[PDB]
Design an enzyme around this catalytic site. Structure first.
Site, PDB file in Angstrom:
ATOM      1  N   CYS A 141       1.356   4.584  -3.592  1.00 18.94           N
ATOM      2  CA  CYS A 141       1.795   5.955  -3.877  1.00 18.94           C
ATOM      3  C   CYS A 141       2.448   6.004  -5.241  1.00 18.94           C
ATOM      4  O   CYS A 141       2.441   7.028  -5.889  1.00 18.94           O
ATOM      5  CB  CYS A 141       2.757   6.507  -2.810  1.00 18.94           C
ATOM      6  SG  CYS A 141       2.032   6.702  -1.147  1.00 18.94           S
TER       7      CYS A 141
ATOM      8  N   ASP B 183       0.837  -1.203   0.000  1.00 24.87           N
ATOM      9  CA  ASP B 183       0.000   0.000   0.000  1.00 24.87           C
ATOM     10  C   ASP B 183       0.878   1.262   0.000  1.00 24.87           C
ATOM     11  O   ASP B 183       0.777   2.135  -0.880  1.00 24.87           O
ATOM     12  CB  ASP B 183      -0.920  -0.165   1.214  1.00 24.87           C
ATOM     13  CG  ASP B 183      -1.492   1.101   1.738  1.00 24.87           C
ATOM     14  OD1 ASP B 183      -2.665   1.074   2.078  1.00 24.87           O
ATOM     15  OD2 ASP B 183      -0.783   2.084   1.903  1.00 24.87           O
TER      16      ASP B 183
ATOM     17  N   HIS C 255       0.806  11.720   6.334  1.00 23.50           N
ATOM     18  CA  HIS C 255      -0.540  11.653   6.964  1.00 23.50           C
ATOM     19  C   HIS C 255      -1.061  13.002   7.409  1.00 23.50           C
ATOM     20  O   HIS C 255      -2.233  13.284   7.251  1.00 23.50           O
ATOM     21  CB  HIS C 255      -0.557  10.691   8.174  1.00 23.50           C
ATOM     22  CG  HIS C 255      -1.936  10.449   8.698  1.00 23.50           C
ATOM     23  ND1 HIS C 255      -2.825   9.597   8.085  1.00 23.50           N
ATOM     24  CD2 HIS C 255      -2.604  10.995   9.748  1.00 23.50           C
ATOM     25  CE1 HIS C 255      -3.975   9.610   8.742  1.00 23.50           C
ATOM     26  NE2 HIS C 255      -3.865  10.441   9.762  1.00 23.50           N
TER      27      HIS C 255
HETATM   28  N1  LIG Z   1      -1.057   9.299   1.308  1.00 27.14           N
HETATM   29  C1  LIG Z   1      -1.013   7.978   1.516  1.00 27.14           C
HETATM   30  O1  LIG Z   1      -1.870   7.209   0.770  1.00 27.14           O
HETATM   31  C2  LIG Z   1      -0.063   7.312   2.480  1.00 27.14           C
HETATM   32  C3  LIG Z   1       0.133   5.913   2.436  1.00 27.14           C
HETATM   33  C4  LIG Z   1       0.878   5.256   3.442  1.00 27.14           C
HETATM   34  C5  LIG Z   1       1.453   5.993   4.492  1.00 27.14           C
HETATM   35  N2  LIG Z   1       1.276   7.368   4.504  1.00 27.14           N
HETATM   36  C6  LIG Z   1       1.884   8.263   5.532  1.00 27.14           C
HETATM   37  O2  LIG Z   1       3.105   8.722   4.939  1.00 27.14           O
HETATM   38  C7  LIG Z   1       4.064   9.044   5.918  1.00 27.14           C
HETATM   39  C8  LIG Z   1       5.335   8.267   5.658  1.00 27.14           C
HETATM   40  O3  LIG Z   1       5.044   6.865   5.712  1.00 27.14           O
HETATM   41  P1  LIG Z   1       6.205   5.734   5.477  1.00 27.14           P
HETATM   42  O4  LIG Z   1       5.505   4.419   5.654  1.00 27.14           O
HETATM   43  O5  LIG Z   1       7.026   6.100   4.275  1.00 27.14           O
HETATM   44  O6  LIG Z   1       7.118   6.083   6.736  1.00 27.14           O
HETATM   45  P2  LIG Z   1       8.661   5.690   6.871  1.00 27.14           P
HETATM   46  O7  LIG Z   1       8.958   5.830   8.321  1.00 27.14           O
HETATM   47  O8  LIG Z   1       8.822   4.333   6.236  1.00 27.14           O
HETATM   48  O9  LIG Z   1       9.436   6.806   6.026  1.00 27.14           O
HETATM   49  C9  LIG Z   1       9.597   8.170   6.412  1.00 27.14           C
HETATM   50  C10 LIG Z   1      11.032   8.575   6.060  1.00 27.14           C
HETATM   51  O10 LIG Z   1      11.213   9.959   6.216  1.00 27.14           O
HETATM   52  C11 LIG Z   1      12.510  10.268   6.666  1.00 27.14           C
HETATM   53  N3  LIG Z   1      12.517  11.637   7.270  1.00 27.14           N
HETATM   54  C12 LIG Z   1      11.988  12.018   8.475  1.00 27.14           C
HETATM   55  N4  LIG Z   1      12.200  13.340   8.623  1.00 27.14           N
HETATM   56  C13 LIG Z   1      12.811  13.813   7.536  1.00 27.14           C
HETATM   57  C14 LIG Z   1      13.230  15.088   7.189  1.00 27.14           C
HETATM   58  N5  LIG Z   1      13.161  16.065   8.092  1.00 27.14           N
HETATM   59  N6  LIG Z   1      13.884  15.279   5.979  1.00 27.14           N
HETATM   60  C15 LIG Z   1      14.063  14.211   5.115  1.00 27.14           C
HETATM   61  N7  LIG Z   1      13.655  12.941   5.475  1.00 27.14           N
HETATM   62  C16 LIG Z   1      13.059  12.745   6.689  1.00 27.14           C
HETATM   63  C17 LIG Z   1      12.768   9.133   7.617  1.00 27.14           C
HETATM   64  O11 LIG Z   1      14.146   9.009   7.774  1.00 27.14           O
HETATM   65  C18 LIG Z   1      12.103   7.936   6.926  1.00 27.14           C
HETATM   66  O12 LIG Z   1      12.993   7.132   6.148  1.00 27.14           O
HETATM   67  C19 LIG Z   1       3.420   8.677   7.222  1.00 27.14           C
HETATM   68  O13 LIG Z   1       2.867   9.856   7.766  1.00 27.14           O
HETATM   69  C20 LIG Z   1       2.320   7.672   6.860  1.00 27.14           C
HETATM   70  O14 LIG Z   1       1.247   7.538   7.776  1.00 27.14           O
HETATM   71  C21 LIG Z   1       0.527   8.035   3.522  1.00 27.14           C
END
Ligand SMILES: NC(=O)c1ccc[n+]([C@@H]2O[C@H](COP(=O)([O-])OP(=O)(O)OC[C@H]3O[C@@H](n4cnc5c(N)ncnc54)[C@H](O)[C@@H]3O)[C@@H](O)[C@H]2O)c1
Ligand SMILES: NC(=O)c1ccc[n+]([C@@H]2O[C@H](COP(=O)([O-])OP(=O)(O)OC[C@H]3O[C@@H](n4cnc5c(N)ncnc54)[C@H](O)[C@@H]3O)[C@@H](O)[C@H]2O)c1
Ligand SMILES: NC(=O)c1ccc[n+]([C@@H]2O[C@H](COP(=O)([O-])OP(=O)(O)OC[C@H]3O[C@@H](n4cnc5c(N)ncnc54)[C@H](O)[C@@H]3O)[C@@H](O)[C@H]2O)c1
Ligand SMILES: NC(=O)c1ccc[n+]([C@@H]2O[C@H](COP(=O)([O-])OP(=O)(O)OC[C@H]3O[C@@H](n4cnc5c(N)ncnc54)[C@H](O)[C@@H]3O)[C@@H](O)[C@H]2O)c1
Ligand SMILES: Nc1ncnc2c1ncn2[C@@H]1O[C@H](CO)[C@@H](O)[C@@H]1O
Lengths: 462, 462, 462, 462
Positions: free
Chosen positions: C227, C222, C333
């Protein structure tokens, strides 16, 4: 012994690989079979100048199966596969080709393809890069005006001009007499075809020529997909470098650069491209490649690849700016894409054959591949058999057409007609399981073509 | 002469390439420099069993720079790069490794890394594939129960069991006495780590082990990106086959298969994948690869690649069904992925070293690579230096940790802590120009990590 | 009327899209069929806070087909598909959601899902983002200590705290009494899962929770493949912008960021990535993306996507440095990844719903999408039915397990067992024609797993 | 009121999107600036038949900024963006277009563009699809021989012939008198260009025409990169379907098909291609696409896209064989690529505008998009501004050239000169930061071109 090759004992190996290559070269095999009864090349004496690879060996024996008598040299000092040469010699064809021959040997070998026994003369040239064509034409000018070979500007010219002198001392009419017998030329590559068009523009083209490069099934397959497989193959056999994460700069974004770009990108390199043509620049940008100047790239990139067919695209100052252990290579037809000669003042240290370190005075080293000579043929084996079958099926058709009907052609550069270009592609579909569909009568009428083709107008770009 | 290598004169070449590899292996170089003052491996006597490549040579000399005394064998009969071996021997390290050694030689070489002069014993194993570990453990069982080496089922076992007999005649306690000195093992590959986990599940693990394979910076880089570059490199050096237009089947879609799939696809192959794991099957399908059974693929595909770590994934009947000149290879750790032994009844014809034709009774031939042994190391040079630096930086950290603090560990398999895994990756960013960003205090508080990391929970999959 | 939706007349349309979605969501169809006879959710009263899309609609009706009684709200003000909400209401489920609802309406709706008639109570939460869970936990803390709602830091908290006050005035025990009845929570997104881990760490978690995000079949599907399809889907519906040739920066290279990057690269964007995690950064660099800081990117890039789950990744000064008509969006999110609040000092001009121009004092404008809220759901329809079936099949199993067996779990965060993760994957194979192969007995013994699986160790990262 | 649009109140929105588009269409902005002083189109009265999008809006206003007076209609019943039409009307240009117009309204609108007030006449046509040109030519033939409009073969012709009759009753010379005033046509799409070549072949072409489709910067950009973005854009807005894991068949592998294929492949579809041209088929196979017949594909594939410019590529029996909820669409110019008429015997159920279920007698349903009309324009917004700027910069130059110098051209089909094609490309480089390099004098002499170009021979295929 009417041949010069590295080691005749490599023949068994060459033959095993020729056997395999036939199963990968359905265009050549099906053309053998279609035309062998007719023996259309009976009385053809073909002087060939072309990378003496396994792939070329399947071509040579196609020409022979069709009745041709053949003499062969390579069009690059490093492109020969010695076991290919040995097997072709063993099967009865004179080959003057080995990997690593000198420039003097190269040009001598270009004469030998023109030295037929029992008073005969070559009557066809099969050329890749225009060197066999050049030799006869420049030699003939020299006969009447020695000044055309008086002032060599580079080591290639020193060797060429020397070999012409040497032959003019033997026979003042060495070239013109052999030229007189040539019914035409079929020319394989962009740089070679460029030489032919210049002779056409000047009215010094003395026979018909086929531009095989610009068959659609050639330029858009061999140049493109072939470099897409063999550029990296060459770089890695040379250096075993990781591509992922590197900044690779491809100078030139024609069919060769497109292929190169695409294979570096696929492996996770950041690909930069350099271009003088804005259409090609925009294409590169549209694939996500940054289009930059060589001056901008020289101090930043990891791997440099020239694919322009132009002169000094990487020059002394670019190399002086490169980072330590930058890899520099050329996949264009001639080594003059890189000003190698300007680095000779520096200390070199050989790493292995065709991989050299150029040590700049501050200790920074550049890794130069194949002394600037085409890197895929020089550090690897050039394009694979399958795509080379397109180019060589074209070649075989062009040789048939000029030998059998050359009298119908003027002293101009021609391309094969679309129906034959289409045939070439069709002959390759079965090997890879592609199912061609057929127009209905109604459909054929609706788009205004015959069910049998040709399917596209002559300006179509594919 | 305390070594066995192909030709000591290849040393100059090996050294030139080790010099280059250092500029491509910033993890190893920076770890040398960080720890050389401390000499943390002083008193370490490391028996290594691991592909004797240029890349391994940079590892070996990192261990030595840190104070280790080292003896080395290869973990595959075909993976050695002889010029790497020669340079390492010339620089003072005993190496028992050459490309093409026999199975009896292989296992003898596995004993030699355990034969230290002046009454000393190895106290660390650096293992890739578990063979050095296996030898000591199985040898020791044999001391008390000869039945464990009585009934070999394949040529590997004939050789192993024979070499154990031979050593037990010399000294009835050959293995147990050497085993007693081992402080632990660091194990590089999925198949090796699998062997360790089985010993753990059984309570026969006699010392601590590091699973280096499952450092994130190992499994997800080396296995994946490394095969993405070296699978095709191996296939092409072997066969020079065109990839575009072929149907390539990759059996297994773990990190090794993912890499393989990705490099075949990038060059325009139709990629089919075979899997027993539905999660991995679904991943493959989500990239556009058709997921098929080997029975379905055997009579249709052009190129077969086993990447499973399993047994007989390509069996006699698959090969009997293959099309003429199908290419069959294995990139998994052991050759038993392919039932090569079942084809010996047929006539073989060698094409060149590591490329053989198996001629079935109807005349159809299969092109088998490296007799089923890992194809990237066997027909090419394995992964490139840059990604191998991840694996080997991990290795060096694991060796430091067990040698210096092994007393803190139980007889279990451990993985390095995330902060070190993160360090390994960080050390490679500069070479390729990647700019790491930094959390603000507010950001660090908001996602609940320290600015310095670790950045991810322990179950994170990357 | 026990619902609040935009327009009940959109139901027919929603129902037709729900019919289609069912054929795209085989995990949910098969789970309904498998558990229909048992009615495992009979007596479950599920409060849901999750984007009210066609996809969530199929989930709702799956839960109802297994016996659950349900009330629903969206977990974002802009992510509801009103035709979806209408069709779910028309079929008997209270829904409190519409696209464009205010923040005050949002939090009122999150209370309504906890207002069951006839004196009943929700006994399960199904959460995405953790807002349902936060409401009851924070609210219960507020009953005894009003200081916890004294200090809102953003508009969503202002609205949340207002809503807690308002409900506390009606009933000083409004939350604690409902909180007591919750038997379990199933949380599906990374940010909500972080909120739950943070609660477990501080002893504040009063019932068992499933982390569904970290099912392999959720996170690695997902978040990634979704995405890879929905990011550009969202940006294009909003702006209709060409991706080819653009510089696109993706902040964060987790699963979401990986998906986003791969999407942008496939259309010919130059993809830059920002990361604080050196491992994630090295992964990005190994795909050929440049790893750069936001400060570097701000005045160069064309498109900006935040994918971090962090705070103020694009700040005021970044936006002020941006080129005219730079496009800025967030796919994480919460909208706080971008400091939209800091731009409210400027004139804004609405282009169309969820597309705004922020007009800077020099006349330079930035195109902000969906006021920083998740762009794929705000400007398009989020991920497609097929991949969402994975996540919601996980949710359904998670609900069944906690509702039926919750008594056996502690008040901690759990993940589903691997065999269930594998089942999720397996259920989706047939729809896409993927054929799973089966281990033989010897093969199963050789790798030490059962034929039925599970096939990988718990640390396996896929 | 001299216009017919859906809603004049949408103008404000259209104007805001036109402002943004201008910053995405640098070729058109720079052409307005370059030719503003000359007003080369002063006295031009341009009748336009071309999808009435934001993009066509920028073209219209470019033509007006250079002096042209304009009247416009869309060249498809479903491709108008009504906010675009509104904004163009509000700024003073008559437009006869709205999304969803009937076929009778369509052809009435194509007459209105030829109804100029105060006794004036259109003296230029700008056509896409050739419908404006067909109207006047067919109409003029009909004046003298009614049999030419006796035999309509589809609903569009029924409507066209009705409209010709109707206008002939008002004025028996309605068409010929307007046709005489046309000084030139500029035609931009492949199908319309085929119609023009077909007219030249039969001596029926009464004024000079430019084929703008076959500018390199049009065909190899708009047709390819445009569809690589807009195909999935259209399918997703219509169906929200997952592309990953699906089998998608692309009928036709010309420029459009190449774009479509590349788009679907990038999202993880298995891409199959159908072709009657063996060269185009071999290109597809070299990218790893399976080349199959529609008969093969009909009962296997998930998504079907026609990209041929041909007739009945998906026929009744194909659709009857399709899986439930197979998605069928067309991206070629005319809907007749799919035999929609043959499905009208079945119950249809509208899902939403331009998304219909065709319900077969066994209950199996097919999802047809936009009643077979071009899907990217019918269900989304067509290609993005950036690439369209190429095509419309070509159109603008084509109009300028024929209007100002038409007297020097014969009544034949021309292409713009290479130097102008290169200019188009060059104008777009700066927006995407591509740096064009410049030949040195020696380099220019070496490859025999001028520094200013053009850089390639006229047969060059790029
Ligand atoms: N829109 C959607 O359909 C959708 C789908 C799934 C998850 N999400 C949301 O997306 C967000 C990310 O999810 P994920 O599963 O990729 O999380 P993740 O933890 O796997 O990835 C986030 C990444 O961001 C990096 N990061 C944090 N702060 C940063 C910054 N200041 N500068 C650059 N990089 C930074 C982290 O090191 C990490 O690798 C969450 O909020 C999640 O709930 C959205
Ligand atoms: N090594 C091989 O196996 C192989 C295969 C096919 C062709 N070739 C040779 O490769 C060369 C390129 O062939 P092609 O078919 O791509 O030719 P091409 O004309 O299609 O491409 C050359 C490109 O280089 C660009 N160029 C010229 N000068 C430049 C400069 N100074 N800087 C940047 N770009 C510049 C041009 O704009 C052009 O687009 C030729 O010499 C040809 O004979 C080699
Ligand atoms: N040659 C190299 O340079 C290289 C590099 C790294 C690892 N390796 C070796 O490669 C092998 C694979 O390693 P990995 O890290 O990908 O392991 P992995 O466990 O991640 O992947 C193996 C996959 O094979 C699948 N599989 C098992 N039996 C199968 C069968 N009969 N048919 C189809 N699929 C089956 C499993 O489902 C699993 O996903 C191991 O032996 C490992 O030591 C080799
Ligand atoms: N929707 C858009 O935005 C868009 C954009 C540009 C062009 N077009 C239109 O798209 C159509 C195709 O344009 P193009 O530039 O690709 O044309 P093209 O001539 O370059 O390609 C069409 C291809 O279809 C093949 N073909 C014909 N009949 C076939 C059949 N029966 N089965 C399989 N293949 C068959 C031909 O061999 C040819 O290669 C035209 O109608 C054109 O006007 C649409
Ligand atoms: N060039 C190289 N030098 C040393 N080791 C290499 C190598 N290439 C591959 N490997 C390793 O092989 C392992 C499988 O046996 C793998 O775990 C590991 O990648």
């Amino acid at each position: 012994q009417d041949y010069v090759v590295a080691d005749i004992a490599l023949a068994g190996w060459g033959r095993k690989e020729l056997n395999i290559a036939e199963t990968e070269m359905p265009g050549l095999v099906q053309i053998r079979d279609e035309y062998k009864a007719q023996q259309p090349l009976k009385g053809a004496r073909i002087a060939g100048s072309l990378h003496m690879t396994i792939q070329t060996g399947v071509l040579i024996e196609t020409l022979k199966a069709l009745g041709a008598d053949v003499r062969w040299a390579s069009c690059n000092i490093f492109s020969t596969q010695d076991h290919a040469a040995a097997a072709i010699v063993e099967a009865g064809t004179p080959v003057f080709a080995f990997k690593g021959e000198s420039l003097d040997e190269y040009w001598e070998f270009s004469h030998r393809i023109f030295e037929w026994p029992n008073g005969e003369f070559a009557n066809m040239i099969l050329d890749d890069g225009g060197d066999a064509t050049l030799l006869l034409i420049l030699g003939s000018k020299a006969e009447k005006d020695r000044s055309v070979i008086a002032r060599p500007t580079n080591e290639e010219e020193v060797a060429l001009f020397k070999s012409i002198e040497r032959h003019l001392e033997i026979d003042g009419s060495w070239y013109s007499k052999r030229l007189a017998h040539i019914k035409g030329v079929t020319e394989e590559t962009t740089t070679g075809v460029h030489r032919l068009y210049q002779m056409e523009k000047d009215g010094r083209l003395p026979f018909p020529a086929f531009n095989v490069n610009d068959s659609v099934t050639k330029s858009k397959f061999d140049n493109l997909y072939g470099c897409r497989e063999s550029l990296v193959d060459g770089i890695k056999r040379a250096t075993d470098v990781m591509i992922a994460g590197k900044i690779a700069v491809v100078a030139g974004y024609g069919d060769v650069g497109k292929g190169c770009a695409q294979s570096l990108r696929g492996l996770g390199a950041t690909v930069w491209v350099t271009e003088i043509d804005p259409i090609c620049a925009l294409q590169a940008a549209m694939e996500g490649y940054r289009v930059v100047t060589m001056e901008y790239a020289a101090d930043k990139a990891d791997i440099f690849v020239t694919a322009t067919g132009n002169y000094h695209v990487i020059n002394h100052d670019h190399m002086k700016a490169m980072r330590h252990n930058a890899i520099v290579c050329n996949i264009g037809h001639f080594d003059s894409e890189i000003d190698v000669a300007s680095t000779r003042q520096y200390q070199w240290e050989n790493i292995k054959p065709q991989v050299d370190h150029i040590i700049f005075p501050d200790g920074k080293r550049v890794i130069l591949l194949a002394e600037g000579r085409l890197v895929n043929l020089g550090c690897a084996t050039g394009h694979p058999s399958f795509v080379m079958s397109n180019s060589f099926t074209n070649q075989t058709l062009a040789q048939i057409e000029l030998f059998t009907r050359g009298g119908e052609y003027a002293n101009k550069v021609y391309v094969l007609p679309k129906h034959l270009d289409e045939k070439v592609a069709r002959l390759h579909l079965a090997r890879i399981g592609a199912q061609l569909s057929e127009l209905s009568d109604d459909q054929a009428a609706y788009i205004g073509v015959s069910k049998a083709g040709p399917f596209k107008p002559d300006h179509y770009r594919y």
